[PDB]
Design an enzyme around this catalytic site. Structure first.
Site, PDB file in Angstrom:
ATOM      1  N   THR A   1       0.997  -1.368  -0.129  1.00  0.00           N
ATOM      2  CA  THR A   1      -0.042   0.097   0.072  1.00  0.00           C
ATOM      3  C   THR A   1       1.124   1.256   0.052  1.00  0.00           C
ATOM      4  O   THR A   1       1.634   1.588   1.130  1.00  0.00           O
ATOM      5  CB  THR A   1      -1.028   0.034   1.357  1.00  0.00           C
ATOM      6  N   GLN A   2       0.646   2.077  -0.975  1.00  0.00           N
ATOM      7  CA  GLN A   2       1.603   3.169  -1.141  1.00  0.00           C
ATOM      8  C   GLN A   2       1.026   4.332  -0.468  1.00  0.00           C
ATOM      9  O   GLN A   2       1.484   5.392   0.223  1.00  0.00           O
ATOM     10  CB  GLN A   2       1.817   3.576  -2.660  1.00  0.00           C
TER      11      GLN A   2
END
Lengths: 247, 146, 229, 233, 239, 233, 212, 232, 240
Positions: free
Chosen positions: G1-2
């Site tokens: 997850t950025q």
């Protein structure tokens, strides 16, 4: 599976490649192809094996293929395999032209194709190309040239040679009646007619079973032509007269 | 098995087989003569000969197990002077993939080994030597295995 | 994974027996005919079903490739479908690049190269099928044949399948350079009639034509139509 | 004689001969014994030398601090299997910071060894193993075969003339659970001695011992290190 | 030489390699499984090849999933490989769809995996037969069996191994459609003892497992106390 | 038919057995280990007088402290030697130490027997190597002599003979060798046996001798040294 | 997850004599919006291990699915070996570090409590692979607000009883509700002891004085 | 990818595919090479001119680099492949090491290539033996021979191909420091050795000469005839 | 006639006459199961009927079935090797789903049969794998062509049909149906079921009871593929 494998790329007890030997024996039956090198040109004469009242005339030739602006070739063997190799020859010659912006020398083109054939006989498990070829062309390095190749991937330059049916008799005659270094395109054409006349024991030259292509240099540009019916018949008639006058 | 082949000679034995089939079961039923048949191969026998009216009870004779091997060795060692040390269970375990003939060979070879050595009664070592002899195992001149 | 060795190998005398047998399967196939008239081409075949139950219109033998090319076969039906799909694929690839319908000669060459690959590739047998391809390009009709070996020939008229020797001998006697498409269709039907062993009906044969308008399979109404004469 | 040339070829009797031959390789190997008690698992192996001037081939190898093996068969295959086991033990410690349970290590071996026995051109692993280890569930002794099968044992012997050893282990099996480490090792040596061909005795040059216990990481005794155990037999 | 690969049909249309694989399965000790109203019960005749083997060694009952059991016969190594495949199929199903795999679907997936090994010469047919059992409130008790050829069917009572025919005869008299797991366990033990041959094989250990309402839909080994009662009942029955 | 990875009825791989048979065609090679050092000797077996004996390299140096003697299909040993040299330099690069003789033998032996036909590699080895190697060197444990066979099995040996005269060369080594033997005695004994087995007359041009000692590095005797030793021998 | 989307706030943990207790509110904030108010952020890993998590809830659900699957697989073998709290803590550290190294982190901060072999365990794991074990833990804003209270008590009294630990957690949860803008009044308490893992229902910080 | 084991061991420890490759080398035309004091000479017997073949394209002596050349005996197509591989390697060695290749180095490269084809999967051994001659940077003449098996050696003088046993026997008796005393004497030694097998002489043998600094040189038919005349 | 050269009898390579013996054996394997099936096309319906043999009471008859639902509007019946037929059924379901996903409308029956036929044709050309020894029959309602019946065999032949059989008594069933088809219409009503059941009952001489056959139908009014229940089958059996 090992059981069904044919082992097409192994050595025989006497150090022989049987698959290559058989392939060459297959070419021994195909139509006769003849090549003669003259002082001012080269020519290819091939026996048009297919002969039937119902076959149509399409393309510019049946066994003579153009590879470049200054090269051509004839084939003897499996026709389908020949089409594969002729396409590869055209690709190789254009790749060289792309790289160097100069037409590929004839010897290099033959070597490139023969390298492909040699690979098939060494590794891969596939059957070799059952085809033998004759090349004619001109280049700035050695002028007019004539080459031959075999399924084994071996090639050599010749002044006059034959491959196909009755090659032995054809080469035997060419060897006897070939004047090295003093042959024009006209004597070369006459010699081709005489050789074809005896090699094709079945019938005689009808001007329909013979295809002749000549390569010459005109105004600094190579010209490849396939002789038409009228001129091929004229050559045959002249050969008939000379044969009559001798007797 | 009957096959459609051009080679003669087999047809004569086929005719004899057909006569045997008729005698076993056919016209004129027989109820006073029984039949016992022994075959090493049943994959080649003709279907008409393996039928249910001719050879009804097909008894399979498997290669002996450990207990069977022990019993065979005991049976064939009944008459010989064998010491009360022989572990027939160990011999059965060590004689895997043997038949009754091979077990009989083991016993007779143990007796012959005892005779060679000049012994009145057999021994477990003699039995093991006989097993080795009957196995007919050859050496590869080297034993590089760990 | 798949065998990597060729199953077709040269025999001691220099023959490729597997290609020889693929032609034998083609020879035993159903008869086919193709005649190149002066202003069009015609392809015909026998479609004798095994019994009344088979649906005659279910599957076609004369299948188009483009708006101007169609082909028929003599040999194994399943192998014909594979080549028809490849032929259509090749025709569209050509059109995408050149924005022009593939010429008949070009399509034959590409299809032939596909069949050749199966005589040299590993773990495959040759296509036991011979194709007849008809086309109309540059205001001229074309008729080609392509055999299991991958070799192709240009014909003015030819036949394949059972008793093709008599079929070709028949065609030679009856052929003429200046024929008309109607006379070509009539001759094509008669050629098939030479060895048919039964009554020929609109459901027992299949016909297709190619001309300036384009290739199209004749309807059973027309096939019965021609049959009547 | 056509059903005994590949491992993917069943015979009519429903037997794969190739697997049978691989089982026959370990038989030609040299003898080795393995037993366990309530606290310890012991491996004793008999090493043999090709020549009088050649060192005796080693038979006991390290896998982890709590697992060891005794090999009998093709050494090259043994090293390949030993290398696989060490990596599996290392990966468990790296990921879970915990010793890999012996049973789970054996299950991995069986899965790996089974694949060759079902694919064309592959062969079984020509080596049998006697795995001795200690985990949260106590001492463990396992036996592996070229056929990808394994057995959880309490005392087993493999190799040439190993049936005489198995006979001894079964006779005295009732005593192994409650014996001390010195007594347990002597039991392993006595069995190995039975395998020996009469006119020959156990020596410090041909006997190697491997011990793993509750508070004893796997250790290998060879050469003069074996003398304390032999003294008394 | 028509029986040397699984990629060749015999002249009469038979894959002998598959047939030989079944023959190997026919040399193992028998293993039975009976479906009932409450759930499913498994039983296996584990022969003790050597007294040196630990009790529970070479267990032939597996838990492919927390609600699915598995009994096997034939080559044990192949069976363990299939059990790993079944676990992989069950785990993958839960991750993708989010709920326990139905037994019918699991049997179909494993059967197709088995069937893929009877089409090419590059691999050989699994030489083992196995049966899957599970119980869910929504789907109820379910029992399946798969052979080397890759064929899967539902059963009310199944047998595989040496004494398949004798076991099938005994299973025919149980009337399992209206019985409970507690009573079936005793019946499963009784059958195994009857089919077993004491004269040929030395000794065996009875392995039992079940899944049903009484276990809350989780496959598990039968408790030691219940197994002891079943063994005593079977021995007493063999008067 | 009879794939490379095939087991004989006695459990012995056919290809390995044949490869071992190929060793008997090689020229004799002898190696003796002594507390003072390790010496390697090999018969060059000159075929014709026109061949240059300097070009026959049957003794090669792996590192400054490791030497190898070869027998069998000499062309096969080239890849094994290259692997040993590369492995030795990788170990120095990583650990800044010198690999032991056993570790070098182990790495080479692992390379051997890694041959296959199906699902192995694009150009993996199709057959085992037909060469037997004698590794001699000095490590933290002192002089070490190791013998490696085509089967991938390696073992330390006090004195070992390989080649066409291995049977009979080993017999002589049995009578003469002893633990307290010096390096000079070992070289003399090795030459005496070699002269006995060799068909041609022993001279300074048709044999190769090298030694490794704790002080000096791998040393190959020159003609002047060879002439000196054979004179006494 | 950025970039996390729906996140949970601080998670608390403290170990007492004979067990461990973990607390966390049931609230998934979508960037300053109390969007989902009935989601449990505590998981029962196995019979002797429980796990709370902060940060992205989707990544927490992914770890729930993966970790739950592994526990199932281990139980299938039935060999008497089960993952300990230390083993699960070690596995999570490796999983989080590996994702961070690949530059695709699991945006979570996890607290692992357990009780095995008569010994309590309490571990911490960040999204970057940082891990350690302490008597008390508090992720997110719990590190600033709740950790000082827990540390002060534990320094005074190294060993706590179950009742003392529970009362201490409730006081910290009250402080977090007062001063944390992403907190919620409904929360869960999970306890692990010799009797297993028990999760308490949606408790509320009833004691909330508002003398303004 | 065809990956069958073409070359495998056999009972008694033999590689039949290697041995067959050797019997394929033996069928080829004879080739001779001698190492002189300041010159290396390569000779080869021509089976037949045929009076029609273009001799330029059938050379059995090729230059791998400016200081190295080789002659083969066996399958012509296989030799062309090996020659090309050596030529690229020679240029590659120049690029990296920045110095001309040595005869031993290139011989080792070719031999390793041949050995690899005897142990690789789905491949046939190279059916050629090569004689590699040249001058090292130090100036010492070198002569090497490589077999299909992958072995190589350094020779004062050797012959390969048909009737190589007799030529080698003749060379062994006729090779001495006196014979190689002068460059002309060295050339005559090669011609006489070839004449031991070939019949016609002069018109049926091709000769190539390499000197220290000068590049490869092919003797003209007039030069060959003159040497033959001097020999008789 | 039956000459052999090499491995023509072991792999799918041409015999000297131009035959594929391995393909022929795949046809011979279809009769190993011992079952027969019949499919008949009506004026506005399609029906497939096949035997159902439960060897013993232990088998769960519910799972023993040869009728499968490829999609909502397509159903099939399989004969021959059990394992092979199921694998082909799975492929057909996948191909039908892929067609719907890619082109946005349900896959016509002819196209589905063509796709399966193409897959089978690959097996007879490539020598690595043997041909599936099973036969498939597909029934469905086309939007502008009415009922459809198609059959594909191991070789790859996939002709359409009006009436068809497959199995041990394919020849006798084919003759029976052809006679009926010749007379008026081979049935032109939803009681086409009676024609099929009579055809199957005639060849095998069974006199079926309700628990010995399974029936699947598709009708223009109700295109969804349905399997008739044992009660409905009994009703048809009593009526005839």
């Amino acid at each position: 599976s090992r059981r069904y494998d044919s082992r097409t790329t192994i050595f025989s007890p006497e150090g022989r490649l049987y698959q290559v030997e058989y392939a060459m024996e297959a070419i021994g039956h195909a139509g006769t192809c003849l090549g003669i090198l003259a002082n001012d040109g080269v020519l290819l004469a091939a026996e048009r094996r297919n002969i039937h009242k119902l076959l149509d005339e399409v393309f510019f030739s049946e066994k003579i293929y153009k590879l470049n602006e200054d090269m051509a070739c004839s084939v003897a063997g499996i026709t389908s395999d020949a089409n594969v190799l002729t396409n590869e020859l055209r690709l190789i010659a254009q790749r060289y032209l792309l790289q160097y912006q100069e037409p590929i020398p004839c010897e290099q083109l033959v070597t490139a194709l023969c390298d492909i054939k040699q690979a098939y006989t060494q590794f891969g498990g596939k059957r070799p190309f059952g085809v033998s070829l004759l090349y004619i062309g001109w280049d700035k390095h050695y002028g007019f040239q004539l080459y031959q190749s075999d399924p084994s991937g071996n090639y050599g330059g010749w002044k006059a040679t034959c491959i196909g049916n009755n090659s032995a008799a054809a080469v035997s005659m060419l060897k006897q009646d070939y004047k090295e270094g003093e042959m024009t395109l006209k004597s070369a054409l006459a010699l081709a007619i005489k050789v074809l006349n005896k090699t094709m024991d079945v019938s005689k030259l009808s001007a329909e079973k013979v295809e002749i292509a000549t390569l010459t240099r005109e105004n600094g540009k190579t010209v490849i032509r396939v002789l038409k019916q009228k001129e091929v018949e004229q050559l045959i008639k002249k050969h008939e007269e000379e044969e009559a006058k001798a007797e | 098995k009957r096959f459609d082949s051009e080679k003669a000679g087999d047809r004569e034995v086929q005719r004899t087989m057909l006569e045997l089939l008729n005698q076993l079961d056919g016209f004129q039923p027989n109820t006073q003569v029984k039949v016992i048949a022994a075959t090493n191969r049943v994959d080649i026998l003709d279907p008409a000969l393996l039928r249910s009216g001719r050879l009804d009870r097909k008894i399979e004779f498997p290669m002996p197990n450990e207990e069977a091997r022990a019993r065979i060795m005991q049976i064939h060692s009944r008459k010989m002077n064998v010491s009360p040390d022989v572990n027939y269970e160990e011999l059965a375990r060590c004689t895997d993939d043997f038949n009754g003939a091979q077990c009989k060979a083991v016993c007779v070879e143990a007796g012959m080994i005892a005779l060679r050595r000049g012994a009145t009664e057999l021994t477990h070592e003699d039995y093991m030597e006989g097993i080795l002899e009957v196995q007919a195992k050859k050496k590869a001149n080297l034993q590089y295995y760990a | 994974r798949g065998y990597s060795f060729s199953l077709t190998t040269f025999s001691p005398s220099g023959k490729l027996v597997q290609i020889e047998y693929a032609l034998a399967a083609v020879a035993g196939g159903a008869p086919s005919v193709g005649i190149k008239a002066a202003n069009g081409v015609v392809l015909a075949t026998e479609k004798k079903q095994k019994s009344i139950l088979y649906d005659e219109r279910s599957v076609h033998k004369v299948e188009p490739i483009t708006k101007h090319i169609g082909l028929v076969y003599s040999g194994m039906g399943p192998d014909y479908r594979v080549l028809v799909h490849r032929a259509r694929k090749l025709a569209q690839q050509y059109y995408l690049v050149y924005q022009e319908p593939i010429p008949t000669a070009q399509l034959v060459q590409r299809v032939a190269s596909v069949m050749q690959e199966y005589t040299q590739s590993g773990g495959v047998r040759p296509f036991g099928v011979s194709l007849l391809i008809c086309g109309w390009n540059e205001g001229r009709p074309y008729l080609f044949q392509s055999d299991p070996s991958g070799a192709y020939f240009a014909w003015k008229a030819t036949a394949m399948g059972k008793n093709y020797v008599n079929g070709k001998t028949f065609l030679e006697k009856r052929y003429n350079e200046d024929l008309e498409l109607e006379d070509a269709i009539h001759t094509a039907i008669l050629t098939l009639k030479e060895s048919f062993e039964g009554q020929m009906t609109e459901d027992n044969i299949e016909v297709g034509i190619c001309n300036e308008a384009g290739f199209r399979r004749l309807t059973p109404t027309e096939v019965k139509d021609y049959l009547a004469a | 004689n056509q059903y005994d040339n590949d491992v993917t070829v069943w015979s009519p009797q429903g037997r794969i001969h190739q697997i049978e031959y691989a089982m026959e390789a370990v038989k030609q190997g040299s003898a080795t014994v393995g037993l366990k008690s309530k606290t310890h698992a012991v491996l004793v192996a008999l090493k043999r030398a090709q020549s009088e001037l050649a060192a005796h081939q080693k038979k006991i190898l390290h896998v982890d601090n709590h697992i060891g093996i005794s090999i009998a068969g093709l050494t090259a295959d043994a090293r390949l299997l030993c290398n696989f086991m060490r990596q599996e033990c290392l990966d468990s410690r790296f990921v879970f910071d915990r010793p890999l349970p012996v049973s789970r290590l054996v299950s991995l071996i069986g899965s790996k060894t089974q694949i060759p026995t079902q694919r064309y051109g592959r062969r079984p692993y020509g080596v049998g193993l006697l795995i001795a280890g200690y985990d949260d569930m106590g001492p463990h002794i396992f036996q592996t075969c070229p056929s990808a099968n394994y057995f959880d044992c309490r005392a087993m012997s493999i190799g040439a003339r190993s049936q005489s050893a198995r006979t001894y282990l079964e006779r005295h099996m009732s005593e192994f659970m409650e014996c001390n480490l010195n007594e347990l090792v002597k039991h392993g040596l006595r069995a190995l001695r039975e395998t020996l061909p009469a006119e020959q005795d156990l020596t410090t040059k041909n006997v190697s011992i491997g011990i793993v216990g509750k508070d004893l990481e796997f250790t290998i005794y060879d050469d003069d290190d074996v003398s304390p155990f032999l003294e008394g037999l | 030489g028509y029986d040397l690969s699984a990629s060749t049909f015999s002249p009469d249309g038979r894959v002998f390699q598959v047939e030989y694989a079944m023959k190997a399965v026919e040399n193992s000790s028998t293993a039975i499984g009976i479906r009932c109203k409450d759930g499913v019960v498994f039983g296996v005749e584990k022969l003790v090849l050597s007294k040196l083997y630990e009790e529970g060694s070479n267990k032939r009952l597996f838990n492919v999933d927390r609600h699915v059991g598995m009994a096997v016969a034939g080559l044990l190594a192949d069976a363990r490989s299939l059990a790993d495949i079944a676990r992989e199929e069950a785990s993958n199903f839960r991750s993708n769809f989010g709920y326990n795999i139905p037994l019918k679907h699991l049997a179909d997936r494993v059967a197709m995996y088995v069937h893929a090994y009877t089409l090419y010469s590059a691999v050989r047919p699994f030489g083992c037969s196995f049966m899957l059992g599970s119980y869910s409130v929504n789907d109820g008790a379910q029992l399946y069996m798969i052979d080397p050829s890759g064929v899967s069917y539902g059963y009310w009572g199944c047998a595989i191994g040496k004494a398949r025919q004798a076991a099938k005869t005994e299973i025919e008299k149980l009337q399992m459609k209206e019985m409970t797991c507690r009573d079936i366990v005793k019946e499963v033990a009784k059958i195994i003892y009857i089919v077993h041959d004491e004269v040929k094989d030395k000794a065996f250990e009875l392995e039992l497992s079940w899944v049903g309402e009484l276990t809350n839909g989780r496959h598990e080994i039968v408790p030691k106390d219940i197994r002891e009662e079943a063994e005593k009942y079977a021995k007493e029955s063999l008067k | 038919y009879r794939g490379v990875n095939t087991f004989s009825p006695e459990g012995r791989l056919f290809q390995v057995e044949y490869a071992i048979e190929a060793i008997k065609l090689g020229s004799t090679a002898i190696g003796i280990q002594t507390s003072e050092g390790v010496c390697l000797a090999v018969e060059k077996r000159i075929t014709s007088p026109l061949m240059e004996p300097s070009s026959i390299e049957k003794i090669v140096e792996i590192d400054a402290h490791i030497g190898c003697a070869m027998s069998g299909l000499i062309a096969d040993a080239k890849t094994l030697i290259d692997k040993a040299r590369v492995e030795t330099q990788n170990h120095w690069f990583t650990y800044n130490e010198t690999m032991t003789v056993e570790s070098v033998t182990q790495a080479v032996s692992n390379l051997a027997l890694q041959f296959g036909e199906e699902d192995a590699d694009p150009g993996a080895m199709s057959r085992p190597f037909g060469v037997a190697l004698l590794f001699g060197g000095v490590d933290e444990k002192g002089p070490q002599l190791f013998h490696m066979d085509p089967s991938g099995t390696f073992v330390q040996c006090d004195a070992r003979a390989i080649g066409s005269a291995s049977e009979g060369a080993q017999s002589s080594l049995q009578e003469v060798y002893h633990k307290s033997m010096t390096l000079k005695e070992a070289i003399k004994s090795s030459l005496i046996i070699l002269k006995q087995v060799m068909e041609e007359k022993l001279n300074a041009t048709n044999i190769e001798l090298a030694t490794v000692q704790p002080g000096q590095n791998f040393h190959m005797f020159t003609k002047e040294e060879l002439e000196e030793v054979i004179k006494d021998i | 997850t950025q970039n996390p989307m729906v996140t949970g706030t601080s998670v608390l943990g403290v170990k007492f004599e004979g067990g461990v207790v973990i607390a966390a509110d049931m609230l998934g904030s979508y960037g300053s919006l109390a969007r989902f108010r009935n989601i449990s952020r505590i998981m029962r890993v196995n019979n002797s291990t429980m796990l709370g998590a902060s940060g992205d809830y989707a990544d927490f659900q992914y770890l729930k699915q993966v970790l739950g699957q592994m526990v199932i697989d281990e139980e299938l073998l039935g060999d008497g070996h089960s993952y300990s709290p230390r083993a699960i803590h070690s596995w999570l550290t490796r999983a989080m570090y590996s994702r961070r190294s690949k530059m695709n982190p699991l945006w979570n901060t996890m607290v692992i409590g357990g009780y095995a072999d008569g010994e309590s365990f309490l571990g911490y794991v960040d999204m970057l692979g940082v891990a350690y074990e302490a008597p008390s833990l508090a992720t997110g804003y719990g590190a600033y607000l709740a950790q000082p209270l827990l540390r002060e008590v534990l320094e005074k009294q190294p060993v706590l009883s179950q009742t003392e630990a529970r009362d201490l957690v409730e006081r910290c949860m009250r402080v977090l509700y007062y001063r944390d803008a992403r907190s919620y009044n409904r929360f869960q308490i999970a306890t692990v002891t010799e009797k297993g893992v028990e999760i308490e229902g949606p408790l509320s910080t009833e004691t909330n004085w508002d003398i303004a | 990818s065809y990956d069958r084991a073409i070359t495998v061991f056999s009972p008694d420890g033999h590689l039949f595919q290697v041995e067959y490759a050797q019997e394929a080398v033996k069928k080829g035309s004879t080739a001779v090479g001698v190492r002189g004091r300041d010159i290396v000479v390569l000779g080869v017997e021509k089976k037949s001119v045929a009076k029609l073949q273009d001799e330029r394209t059938v050379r059995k002596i090729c230059a791998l680099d400016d200081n190295v050349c080789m002659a083969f005996a066996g399958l012509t197509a296989d030799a062309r492949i090996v020659i090309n591989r050596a030529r690229v390697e020679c240029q590659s060695h120049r690029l990296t090491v920045e110095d001309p290749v040595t005869v031993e180095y290139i011989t080792r490269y070719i031999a390793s290539l041949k050995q690899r084809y005897t142990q690789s999967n789905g491949r046939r051994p190279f059916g050629i033996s090569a004689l590699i001659v040249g001058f090292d940077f130090d100036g010492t003449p070198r002569l090497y021979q490589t077999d299909p098996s992958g072995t190589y050696h350094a020779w004062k003088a050797n012959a390969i191909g048909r009737g190589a046993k007799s030529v080698r026997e003749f060379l062994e008796k006729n090779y001495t420091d006196e014979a190689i005393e002068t460059d002309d004497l060295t050339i005559k030694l090669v011609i006489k050795a070839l004449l031991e097998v070939v019949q016609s002489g002069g018109k049926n043998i091709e000769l190539a000469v390499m000197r220290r600094d000068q590049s490869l040189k092919i003797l003209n038919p007039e030069e060959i005839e003159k040497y033959v005349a001097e020999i008789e | 006639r039956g000459s052999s050269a090499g491995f023509d009898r072991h792999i799918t390579i041409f015999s000297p006459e131009g035959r594929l013996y391995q393909v022929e054996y795949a046809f011979k394997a279809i009769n190993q199961g011992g079952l027969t099936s019949v499919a008949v096309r009506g004026k506005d319906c399609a029906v497939i009927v096949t035997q159902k043999k439960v060897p013993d009471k232990l088998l769960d008859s519910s799972t023993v079935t040869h009728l499968f639902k490829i999609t909502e509007n397509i159903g099939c019946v399989m004969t021959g090797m059990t394992a092979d037929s199921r694998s082909q059924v799975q492929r057909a379901r996948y191909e039908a789903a892929n067609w719907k996903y890619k082109y946005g409308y349900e896959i016509p029956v002819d196209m589905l049969c063509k796709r399966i036929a193409d897959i089978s044709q690959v097996y007879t050309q490539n020598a690595e794998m043997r041909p599936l020894g099973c036969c498939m029959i597909l029934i469905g309602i086309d939007e502008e062509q009415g009922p459809q019946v198609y059959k594909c065999d191991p070789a790859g032949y996939y002709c359409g049909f009006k009436a068809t059989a497959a199995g041990v008594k394919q020849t006798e069933s084919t003759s029976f149906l052809e006679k009926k088809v010749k007379k008026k219409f081979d049935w032109t009503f939803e009681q086409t079921v009676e024609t099929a059941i009579t055809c199957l009952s005639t060849v095998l001489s069974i006199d079926f009871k309700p628990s010995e056959i399974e029936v699947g139908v598709v009708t223009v009014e109700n295109p969804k593929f349905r399997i008739l229940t044992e009660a409905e089958i009994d009703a048809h059996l009593v009526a005839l």
